[PDB]
């Protein structure tokens with residue numbers, strides 16, 4: 185009844201809020217802009233004072249917030265990063281580790297993102313969860329804002345849930361996105377602007393790639409755009425379409441632009457008809473402001489959003505994901521390069537599967553054919569590293585040189601067609617490699 189009393193009972197300082205987290209326990213937190221900076225600074229301070237140890241932190245899509253606080257190299261003996269999505273922050277720590285006498289200082293947890301709630305709650309176990317939230321309303325509810333992902337699950341399965349109120353966090357509607365005061369164990373307040381995703385510049389290959397993708401996007405398509413420079417930028421070629429839908433893992437500025445233009449109506453979707461579905465959002469200040477109180481954008485947990493069976497219920501799904509390497513069988517490595525983990529599988533394989541199962545659906549893995557100012561081919565004979573998308577799941581591949589649909593093709597047909605999507609400079613090498621491997 186008296187929510188203002190409950191609020192005041194639970195309101196405290198960051199120092200006090202983090203002071204009873206146990207050593208030897210498991211902590212998790214929201215992704216990117218949902219990482220709570222005051223709480224994380226106070227947690228890092230505990231580690232600096234030698235007052236906590238053996239604390240595993242399980243998390244994804246790192247921001248400067250955590251990079252500057254609990255993930256500082258000097259604390260890694262006490263706060264152990266268990267990243268589910270490697271970023272520049274972790275890649276820096278890794279390099280520093282190897283410089284520091286070949287030390288290993290970051291842990292990586294492979295996963296399908298649709299399984300992340302189950303992994304965190306049941307396989308791993310999370311004792312404490314921390315997340316930035318929008319302010320409590322007059323009915324006693326906060327919102328997870330840009331986050332839903334696994335947060336909406338782990339906030340409830342965790343034994344303690346600590347929130348950081350920030351009036352800059354948009355109030356977002358969604359499944360389990362609203363948090364009642366009775367579900368929170370402690371509150372701190374810290375009003376600061378959200379962290380922004382950097383804007384990536386286009387490269388010339390995107391003109392051809394975007395035109396090939398545009399021809400593959402049917403009427404009434406239901407869009408998902410993966411993380412990376414390319415998907416967010418490519419979907420701008422769809423500004424002339426109508427009645428598109430959104431069912432995506434990440435909501436990015438490119439998709440929101442299509443909403444703002446009136447391209448996306450969601451009227452052809454079977455599930456969530458009339459609303460754009462996402463599990464978490466990353467962008468700049470303009471996007472975050474636009475999400476606040478939006479009645480046609482609706483977050484849902486990742487065990488719903490990334491479930492292939494759910495994705496498939498909408499007709500004409502179009503999934504556009506990026507990769508680093510494609511081999512001559514159509515297997516893709518989207519997460520590992522130059523000897524180290526670079527990112528993660530994430531929800532890539534979730535959406536490759538879901539999109540093919542959608543009636544009229546298409547999964548696209550798209551990439552420039554080369555890297556390193558044209559000196560390296562992204563089409564290679566054989567992946568030396570982990571496979572993100574196995575050859576039996578890959579549907580379409582697109583480069584600036586065209587498209588191939590791998591489903592039902594023999595190994596010979598796959599290799600010959602993939603070779604013709606490589607840059608001309610590499611096709612003879614690849615053909616000879618295919619012969620040696622007996623693909624052709």
Ligand SMILES: CC(C)(COP(=O)(O)OP(=O)(O)OC[C@H]1O[C@@H](n2cnc3c(N)ncnc32)[C@H](O)[C@@H]1OP(=O)(O)O)[C@@H](O)C(=O)NCCC(=O)NCCS
Nearest residue numbers: 410411412413505506507508518527529530531532555556
């Ligand atoms: C594949 C993925 C890493 C691409 O992200 P990205 O930031 O767009 O990567 P880029 O293509 O720009 O490549 C990054 C750098 O590595 C280089 N590079 C890319 N592929 C390379 C390769 N095979 N060999 C050597 N260098 C390569 C690039 O030249 C680039 O260099 P730069 O720093 O000068 O720009 C990203 O999409 C990802 O993490 N995917 C997995 C998760 C996923 O698909 N989720 C879908 C649900 S959201």
